[PDB]
Amino acid sequence: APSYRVRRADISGHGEEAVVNAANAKGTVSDGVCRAVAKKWPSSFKGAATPVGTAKMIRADGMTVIHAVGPNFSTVTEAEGDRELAAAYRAVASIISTNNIKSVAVPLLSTGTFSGGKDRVMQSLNHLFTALDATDADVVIYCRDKNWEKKIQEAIDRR
Ligand SMILES: Nc1ncnc2c1ncn2[C@@H]1O[C@H](COP(=O)(O)OP(=O)(O)OC[C@@H](O)[C@@H](O)[C@@H](O)CO)[C@@H](O)[C@H]1O
């Protein structure tokens, strides 16, 4: 069974075997988790473009980077975005299990740039749990907000 922890830290400083980038479909560097991943593992972005609701893995810069593209909730209906967000996390879980990845640092997809201005911490976290429950990986969830950290810890504890 997987284990879940939360850290309030820059995800570029993670101590796991792999890191999930909250990516865009075009594989461009812009504000958010992506900028931190690009600074620490710059060559991880080569050929990283992948459609919304999918993930694409690369080994670069001594790191396994998994580019996962959550939906932009400004560009889909709520129900369409919920389906696509579930799909992005399942694509992450499939890459973790098929590549024997033992531990992974994960940000909450679609909770920042792609949130459509809504609080989606619980929506994103519930899809993260449902998908990564299919793996045996140690999962470390990364956030920057003290209230998010507590919410996430509370949700981990309830389990
Ligand atoms: N360094 C950091 N360490 C830990 N947590 C971090 C972080 N930088 C941002 N976060 C948080 O990670 C979540 C995803 O944000 P993001 O805004 O990065 O994630 P999405 O909402 O999925 O949007 C993706 C787009 O930003 C896309 O264009 C990419 O270029 C960018 O990622 C948000 O809750 C952010 O507050």
Side-chain angles (χ1 to χ4, degrees), residues 9-11 22 24 30-34 36 108 110-114 144 148:
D10 191 340
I11 200 169
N24 61 61
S30 54
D31 294 333
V33 159
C34 195
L108 293 184
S110 296
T111 63
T113 305
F114 283 173
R144 300 313 288 287
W148 287 33

Side-chain angles (χ1 to χ4, degrees), residues 30 36 48 64 66 85 87 94 96 100 113 125-126 129 141 143 150:
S30 54
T64 300
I66 305 167
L85 180 56
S94 178
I96 288 157
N100 193 35
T113 305
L125 186 58
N126 284 336
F129 288 141
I141 303 167
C143 65
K150 286 192 138 196

